[PDB]
C-alpha cells in the first residue's frame, strides 16, 4: 500500500533512475540510472555474485548481445517470442492484444445491465487469455466488438509481433541478427567449453550478468516493463539420475510461501511451508530445484524484499517441451510480479543446437553413457528486484515536513556511513581523515557530508537515499579528551556516543549483522 | 616480439576468450569470455573503479544502449560515423576502402620496376589517406587501378558506410534507432541532472562503464577490432577560466614517452619527458589534461602494461569542432594501437543537444555568467587494454615442454593464490578451511587446486592462467609441529616455508606491494 507517487518523486528527485532521453522527449521502456541508482544496482550485483557465483563456485562467462539469426531460429524465438498485437484501422496506433481484450471484458463485467451468466462466460474467457491462438483471438475480438480505447475506431485482426530487436551484422544484408532476449543461449552455445573446463564432470553451473532486450509494444509500468535490462542468469546442469543436491539441508528449515499449480487450479491460497516438508510431500519435485528456491529466497530477503510480500508460484500446465517452473513473485503496487524465474527442464535448447550444428552437446559418464543433462535455471530480473526493494523499504517519517527514507539493508545501501563534521578546518581534518581510512580498512563505504543546514537536515538528505549509519564529528570530538563522536542509526534516528577510534569496528559489526542497534545501546552511552 | 600464435593457443585453450557462436560457424568481431577471462576482465574494471571513480569521486551513471535516431543525428554520427567501403562488382564482397588502397600502394612501392619518384608520390598519398573525401578517393581508385585482392575483379566506387547498428524501437517503423557507438552522449544528455546533483558547482566528472557497438566491415585483428565491446569513459567538465587541476603535482614527476603532433610532422622520435616539464614547455596544454594523462599512465601500468611499450601520441591537425587530443598507445604484435583516448574540447556535443532540444545545457556562476564547460574525455577500451596485458605479460618457461605463464600483476590475476593440499582427508580439512577463511579475511582471492599430477605440474596449470602465488599443504604441514606450508612465487618459481598461520598476511603484503619476494626470502627459510 506504498505511496507510489511520493516514492517516484523521491526516486526521480534524488536520481536513482529517470527517463532516458528526457530532453529529446523520452523513450518509454528505457531508463538511465544516476549515481545513487548505480551504487544500489552495483551493490545488488555484488551481493548476487557472493551469494551465487562464489557460494556455488559457478563458472562465469560473458557472451555477446549481438546474435545472428540462425542461433535464435533454433531456440524458437524467431517463431514464438511474440505478443499478439492489434492496431487502429485509421491512425495506426499499436496495442498489445491480450491486455486490450482483458480491459474490454473487465469493463463489460462491471456493467449493471450485464447478466450473471454473461459475466461467468467472460471470467472463463479471462482464464484462457494466454492459451488462445491467432484465429480464436481474432474471433474473440469480433464477438466482443473490441475497439480502440483511445479513439474508439475499429481494430485490425490480431497479428504476431516478435519482440526481438532486429539489426544486421556486417555490411550488405546477408547476416541478419538480433539483440539477445536472454543470456541462457550463450551458456548453451558454450556447453562443450564449459564441460571441458569442468574436467568433463557433472554437475556444474554457469552464469552471465548482462543486458538483454525485449521490444515491448507499449511499456507504461515504470521499471517493471522495460525494453533494455540487466539479468543475472544461472544454468545449473545436473545428471537426471544424480538429481539430489548435497547442500539442500542448509535451506530445508526455511519457511516460505509456496503457491502450487494445484492451489491455483483448486482456487485456494498460498501456503507457508517448511522447504524440507514441501520436498517430502511432492510439492517441490526435487532437492536441486529446492536448494535454489531457498537460495533465491535468502538472496531476495537479504537484499531488502519483505518475506510477508514474497511467494513462490508454480506454473500451470497451460503456460507451457514443458517444465516444472517456479517464479519468485513480490507483492507490489502493480500487484504480484515475477522477479526471479526458476525452471527445471529435461528437454530444452541444448538438444536443438546440437542437431542444428551437428556438434554433440552431451556429457559422457564412464561403460560410456551419453548424458543429456537436466537444468535448473534461476533467472534474476535485477531491475524488478530493485524496484521491489524500493516499494518494500520506502517509509515516510512522522512529521509535518513528510521526510522520507529507504530502510535499505546495509549490504545494498548506496553507502553504509555518512560522515558529517561540523567543520573542515585544520583541527578537524586529522579526525576525518583517520575515520575515513579506518572505515576503509573495515570495508565500510562512506561519504563525507558537505551539505547545508542543521545536523538533522543534513542527515535527512542522507536518509532520503537510504544511507544506513552516520557519524557526527563536532567540536567536543576535536577538543575534549577522549575524542568521541555521535553514531546515528538511520531507521530509529537514535544516537550514541563512542570513542572516535572504536566506531569503525562498531559500524562494521552493525553493517554485517554481527551486532544489533540494541546491542550498541546496551554497551555505549545514549546521546541526543 | 611475442609469439602471438602460442599466446593465442593458451588464451583459447584455457578459455580466456574465444570466438562467439563457434558451433554456428562463428561471427567475426564477436567474442565470448570464459571463466578466467571474466575474472581478469572484472579485476581490470574493479581496479579502474578505484583508480578513477573512487579516487576523483566521479559521478557514475548507467544509460541505455538503445538510442533513438535524432539523438545521434545531433551528435553527427548519422552523417559522419562511417568508413568508406568498396565492393566487388561481380560477387559483391565488401572491403574497407582505406585499407585496400594502402595495401595496393604498399604492393607497388615494393616493386623493383617502380621508379623512385613514383614511390615518393605514393608515400605522400599514404600521408593523406584519412583526409581524402569521397570523390578524390574514387579517383585514387581509378588512377591506381585497384582491384579485389581475392578475385581480382573491378571494384565499385567508394561509398560511405555508417558503422552504427540500426534497429527500430517499438512497433511499426516510426522510431528508428541505433545501438550507441559510445557512452559520452548519455553523459551529455544527463548534464543538467548531473550538474544539479553536484549542487550546480564546477568542476565535476561523470563516468559510464558499459558496452558500445561498432559495425566494422571486416574485423580480422582478434580482440583489437571487435563489433561489441566494453568501454569505461569519463567526462570531466571544467570552467575554461579555472582550468588548473589541484592534484596535478601528484603526477608531475612521472616520466613518460610523449609523441607530439610536432614530432610526428617533423618526423622525429617520441620523447621521454617529466610530466611537469611537458606542461611547462607547452607540450601538454594544461594541468587538467596533464593530470589525467598521468592517471591513465598509472592505471595502465598498474594493470600490467609495460612502460617501455607505452606512449602518449598527440593527434595531428588533419585528424580533426577540433580538439587537443592525446591517445595512450601500446606497442603490440599489431604495432602501436590506441587503448585510451583523452580529448580536450571547448566546443562539442553539449551545445548541439542544447539547441536541438531548446534545453539550456550550461553552468551558472555567480553576477551571473553563462559557463559552457570544457571537457577532458578519458576513454578506455577495456578489451584492448586486456589484450595488451596478454602480450606484455606472456612468457615461455625455460624447458623442453615449453610451459608458459602470464606475469599478471596481483591486482588483475584471475585469482591471487592457488591452495594445493596433498590430501583432502579429515586430517587436512581443518588446515585448508582455516587457510581459506584467513585469505578471505585478508582480501586475498584463492582457489583450492584439485587437479591431477605432481605438485609442479599442478602449479604449471595455475601459472598458465597467471595466478600470482601458491600455498602447498603437505603431510609435514599437518603432522609436524609447528604447522608450516610452502609459499611459491609464480614468476621465479622460488619457494619459502612459513607457519600456516603467518602466510595469509604474507601473501596479502606481497599482493599489495607492501613487501617484495626478496623481502620474504630475507625473513623466511628458503624451501625446495
The verdict on a CB contact (< 8 Å) between A23 and B353 is yes
The verdict on a CB contact (< 8 Å) between B359 and A166 is no
Residues linked to residue A162 through DSSP beta bridges, in sequence order = A82
Burial (0-12, 13-18, 19+ Cβ within 10 Å), B3: middle
A77: left (phi over 0), alpha (psi -120 to 50) or beta: alpha
User: b/e map of B361-387 (b: 16 or more CB within 10 Å)?
Assistant: bebeeeeeeebbbbbbbbbbbbbbbbb
B401 to chain A, closest Cα gap in Å: 22
Q: Residue A152 contacts by C-beta under 8 Å, 6 or more apart in sequence?
A: none
Q: Binding site annotation covers A228?
A: no
Q: Binding site annotation covers A437?
A: no
Task: Give CA A267 to chain center in angstroms.
Answer: 27
Output the CA–CA distances (angstroms, integers) from residue A184 to A196, A235, A236, A394, B139, in the order listed: 18, 7, 11, 33, 50
Secondary-structure percent of chain B, ordered helix, strand, coil, rounded to 5: 35, 25, 40
User: b/e map of A141-180 (b: 16 or more CB within 10 Å)?
Assistant: beeeebbbeeeeeebbebeebbbbbebbbbbeeeeebbbb
Q: Strands B469-473 and B484-489: what pairing? A: antiparallel
Residues of B whose CB is below 8 A from A217? 170-171
Q: Binding site annotation covers A521?
A: no
Give the number of other CB atoms < 10 A from CB of residue B46.
13
> Count H helices, E strands: chain B?
19, 27
Alpha helix stretches (DSSP H) within B221-260: none
> Whole-angstrom Cα distance, residue B317 to residue B460?
50
SS3 state at B343: strand
Q: CB-CB: which of A34, A94, A168 is closest to B171? A: A94
> Whole-angstrom Cα distance, residue B511 to residue B514?
8
A319 to chain B, closest Cα gap in Å: 25
The verdict on a CB contact (< 8 Å) between B35 and A192 is no
Give the number of other CB atoms < 10 A from CB of residue B523.
12
- Is-contact A300 A385, C-beta < 8 A? yes
Output the CA–CA distances (angstroms, integers) from residue B323 to A524, B316, B346, B362, B410, in the order listed: 59, 10, 8, 20, 37
A403's grid cell: 521526510
Q: CB-CB: which of B15, B24, B228 is closest to A68? A: B24
The verdict on a CB contact (< 8 Å) between B68 and A167 is no
A237's grid cell: 546442469
The verdict on a CB contact (< 8 Å) between A21 and B227 is no
A199: left (phi over 0), alpha (psi -120 to 50) or beta: left
Mutant choice from A32, A41, A100 vs B, greatest count of B C-beta within 10 A: A32
B320's grid cell: 580533426
The verdict on a CB contact (< 8 Å) between B70 and A24 is yes
B510 to chain A, closest Cα gap in Å: 17
SS3 state at A126: helix
The verdict on a CB contact (< 8 Å) between A68 and B21 is yes
DSSP annotation of A429 reads: H
> Whole-angstrom Cα distance, residue B462 to residue B457?
9
By C-alpha distance, which of A502, A491, A419, A403 is closest to A455? A419
Give the number of other CB atoms < 10 A from CB of residue B98.
17
Give the number of other CB atoms < 10 A from CB of residue B433.
11
SS3 state at A355: helix
The verdict on a CB contact (< 8 Å) between B169 and A227 is yes
User: b/e map of B457-487 (b: 16 or more CB within 10 Å)?
Assistant: ebbbbbbbbbbbbbbbbbeebbeeeebbbbb
> Whole-angstrom Cα distance, residue B118 to residue B112?
11
> Whole-angstrom Cα distance, residue B180 to residue B64?
8
A441's grid cell: 580498512
The verdict on a CB contact (< 8 Å) between B167 and A172 is no
The verdict on a CB contact (< 8 Å) between B20 and A63 is yes
The values of phi and psi at residue B448, to 5°, are -65, 125
The verdict on a CB contact (< 8 Å) between A357 and B165 is no
> Whole-angstrom Cα distance, residue A373 to residue A239?
5
The verdict on a CB contact (< 8 Å) between B66 and A34 is no
The verdict on a CB contact (< 8 Å) between A63 and B186 is no
Q: Residue B393 contacts by C-beta under 8 Å, 6 or more apart in sequence?
A: B304, B406, B407, B408, B466
A vs B: CB pairs below 8 A: 178
DSSP annotation of B290 reads: H
Task: Give CA B251 to chain center in angstroms.
Answer: 21
Mutant choice from B60, B209, B382 vs A, greatest count of A C-beta within 10 A: B60
What length does chain A have? Answer: 528
Output the CA–CA distances (angstroms, integers) from residue A214 to A41, A169, A218, A335, in the order listed: 20, 19, 11, 22
> Whole-angstrom Cα distance, residue B453 to residue B467?
18
> Whole-angstrom Cα distance, residue B193 to residue B59?
11
Secondary-structure percent of chain A, ordered helix, strand, coil, rounded to 5: 35, 25, 40
- Is-contact A184 A377, C-beta < 8 A? yes
A263 to chain B, closest Cα gap in Å: 37
The verdict on a CB contact (< 8 Å) between B21 and A67 is yes
By C-alpha distance, which of A198, A379, A62 is closest to B44? A62
A246 to chain B, closest Cα gap in Å: 18
A114 to chain B, closest Cα gap in Å: 35
SS3 state at B361: coil
Mutant choice from B11, B16, B19, B20 vs A, greatest count of A C-beta within 10 A: B20
Q: Output the DSSP codes for A293-354.
A: HHHHHHHHHHTT--GGGEEEEEPPTTT----EEEEEEEEETTEEEEEEEEEEESS-HHHHHH
Give the number of other CB atoms < 10 A from CB of residue B253.
11
SS3 state at A64: coil
**Scanning every residue of chain B, which has its alpha carbon at the shortest distance from the alpha carbon of A41?**
B62
By C-alpha distance, which of B229, B279, B232 is closest to B251? B279
Domains of chain B: 1-79+164-407 (3.30.930.10), 80-163 (3.30.40.230), 408-528 (3.40.50.800)
The verdict on a CB contact (< 8 Å) between A31 and B168 is no
A167 to chain B, closest Cα gap in Å: 5
A278 to chain B, closest Cα gap in Å: 33
> Whole-angstrom Cα distance, residue A478 to residue A430?
9
Would you call the peptide bond into B482 cis, given omega within 30 degrees of 0 as the criterion?
yes
- Residues A257, A262, A268, CA angle at the centre, nearest 5°? 65
B128's grid cell: 593523406
Q: CB-CB: which of A27, A38, A357 is closest to B24? A: A357
**Method of determination?**
X-ray
The verdict on a CB contact (< 8 Å) between B170 and A67 is no
Task: Give CA A355 to chain center in angstroms.
Answer: 34
Residues linked to residue A380 through DSSP beta bridges, in sequence order = A232, A340
A512 to chain B, closest Cα gap in Å: 14
Residues of B whose CB is below 8 A from A209? none
The verdict on a CB contact (< 8 Å) between B35 and A61 is yes
Residues of B whose CB is below 8 A from A85? 171
- Residues A460, A464, A465, CA angle at the centre, nearest 5°? 130
Contacts of residues A222-227 at CB distance under 8 Å and 24 or more positions apart, as own/partner, are A222/A8, A222/A387, A223/A17, A223/A31, A223/A383, A223/A384, A223/A386, A223/A387, A224/A332, A224/A334, A224/A337, A224/A384, A224/A387, A225/A29, A226/A29, A226/A30, A226/A31, A226/A383, A227/A29, A227/A30, A227/B66, A227/B169
Q: Output the DSSP codes for A232-248.
A: EEEEEEE-STT---TTG
By C-alpha distance, which of B470, B494, B265, B242 is closest to B371? B242
Resolution in A: 2.8
Mutant choice from A11, A20, A225 vs B, greatest count of B C-beta within 10 A: A20
Q: What is the dihedral of CA A188, A191, A192, A196, to 10 degrees?
A: 170
> Whole-angstrom Cα distance, residue B475 to residue B455?
13
Burial (0-12, 13-18, 19+ Cβ within 10 Å), B12: middle
Mutant choice from B27, B186, B512 vs A, greatest count of A C-beta within 10 A: B27
Residues of B whose CB is below 8 A from A353? 23
SS3 state at A439: helix
The verdict on a CB contact (< 8 Å) between B94 and A34 is no
Residues of B whose CB is below 8 A from A18? 193
Residues linked to residue B485 through DSSP beta bridges, in sequence order = B498
Q: Measure CA of the first residue to CA of the last residue in chain B; give whole Å.
A: 33
By C-alpha distance, which of B295, B262, B264, B260 is closest to B278? B260
A87 to chain B, closest Cα gap in Å: 10
Mutant choice from B11, B12, B23, B206 vs A, greatest count of A C-beta within 10 A: B23
Task: Give CA B322 to chain center in angstroms.
Answer: 24
Q: CB-CB: which of A20, A28, A189 is closest to B21? A: A189
Q: Residue B203 contacts by C-beta under 8 Å, 6 or more apart in sequence?
A: B236, B237, B238, B239, B242, B373
Amino acid at each position: 500500500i506504498v505511496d507510489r507517487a511520493k516514492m517516484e518523486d523521491t526516486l526521480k528527485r534524488r536520481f536513482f533512475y529517470d527517463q532516458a532521453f528526457a530532453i529529446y522527449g523520452g523513450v518509454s521502456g528505457l531508463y538511465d540510472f544516476g549515481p545513487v541508482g548505480c551504487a544500489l544496482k552495483n551493490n545488488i550485483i555484488q551481493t548476487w555474485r557472493q551469494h551465487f557465483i562464489q557460494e556455488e563456485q559457478i563458472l562465469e562467462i560473458d557472451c555477446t548481445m549481438l546474435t545472428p539469426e540462425p542461433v535464435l531460429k533454433t531456440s524458437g524465438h524467431v517463431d514464438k517470442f511474440a505478443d499478439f498485437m492489434v492496431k487502429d484501422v485509421k491512425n495506426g496506433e499499436c496495442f498489445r492484444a491480450d491486455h486490450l481484450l482483458k480491459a474490454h471484458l473487465q469493463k463489460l463485467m462491471s456493467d449493471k445491465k450485464c447478466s450473471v451468466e454473461k459475466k461467468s462466460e467472460m471470467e472463463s474467457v479471462l482464464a484462457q487469455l494466454d492459451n488462445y491462438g491467432q484465429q480464436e483471438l481474432a474471433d474473440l475480438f469480433v464477438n466482443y466488438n473490441v475497439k480502440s480505447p483511445i479513439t474508439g475506431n475499429d481494430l485490425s485482426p490480431p497479428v504476431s509481433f516478435n519482440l526481438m530487436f532486429k539489426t544486421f551484422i556486417g555490411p550488405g544484408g546477408n547476416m541478419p541478427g538480433y539483440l539477445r532476449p536472454e543470456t541462457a543461449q550463450g551458456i548453451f552455445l558454450n556447453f562443450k567449453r564449459l564441460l571441458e573446463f569442468n574436467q568433463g564432470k557433472l554437475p556444474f553451473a554457469a552464469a552471465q550478468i548482462g543486458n538483454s532486450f525485449r521490444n515491448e509494444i507499449s511499456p507504461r509500468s515504470g521499471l517493471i516493463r522495460v525494453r533494455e535490462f540487466t539479468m543475472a542468469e544461472i544454468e545449473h546442469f545436473v545428471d537426471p539420475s544424480e538429481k539430489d543436491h548435497p547442500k539442500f539441508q542448509n535451506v530445508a528449515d526455511l519457511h516460505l510461501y509456496l503457491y502450487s499449480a494445484k492451489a491455483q487450479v483448486s482456487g485456494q491460497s498460498a501456503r507457508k511451508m517448511r522447504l524440507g516438508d514441501a520436498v517430502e510431500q511432492g510439492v517441490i519435485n526435487n532437492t536441486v530445484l529446492g536448494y535454489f528456491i531457498g537460495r533465491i529466497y535468502l538472496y531476495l530477503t537479504k537484499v531488502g524484499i519483505s518475506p510477508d510480500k514474497l511467494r513462490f508460484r508454480q506454473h500451470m500446465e497451460n503456460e507451457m517441451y514443458a517444465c516444472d517452473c517456479w517464479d519468485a513473485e513480490s507483492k507490489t503496487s502493480y500487484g504480484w510480479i515475477e522477479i526471479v524465474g526458476c525452471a527445471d527442464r529435461s528437454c530444452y535448447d541444448l538438444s536443438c543446437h546440437a542437431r542444428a550444428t551437428k556438434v554433440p552437446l552431451v556429457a559422457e559418464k564412464p561403460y560410456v553413457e551419453e548424458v543429456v543433462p537436466n537444468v535448473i535455471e534461476p533467472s534474476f530480473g535485477l531491475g524488478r528486484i530493485m524496484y521491489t526493494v524500493f516499494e518494500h523499504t520506502f517509509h515516510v517519517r512522522e512529521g509535518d515536513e513528510q521526510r522520507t527514507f529507504f530502510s535499505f539493508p546495509a549490504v545494498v545501501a548506496p553507502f553504509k556511513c555518512s560522515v558529517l563534521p561540523l567543520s573542515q578546518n585544520q583541527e578537524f581534518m586529522p579526525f576525518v581523515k583517520e575515520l575515513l581510512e579506518a572505515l576503509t580498512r573495515h570495508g565500510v563505504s562512506h561519504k563525507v557530508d558537505d551539505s547545508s543546514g542543521s545536523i538533522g537536515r543534513r542527515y535527512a538528505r542522507t536518509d532520503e537515499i537510504g544511507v544506513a549509519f552516520g557519524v557526527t564529528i563536532d567540536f567536543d570530538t576535536v577538543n575534549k579528551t577522549p575524542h568521541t563522536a555521535t553514531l546515528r542509526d538511520r531507521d530509529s534516528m537514535r544516537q550514541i556516543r563512542a570513542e572516535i577510534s572504536e566506531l569503525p569496528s562498531i559500524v562494521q559489526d552493525l553493517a554485517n549483522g554481527n551486532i544489533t542497534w540494541a546491542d550498541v545501546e546496551a554497551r555505549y552511552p545514549l546521546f541526543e
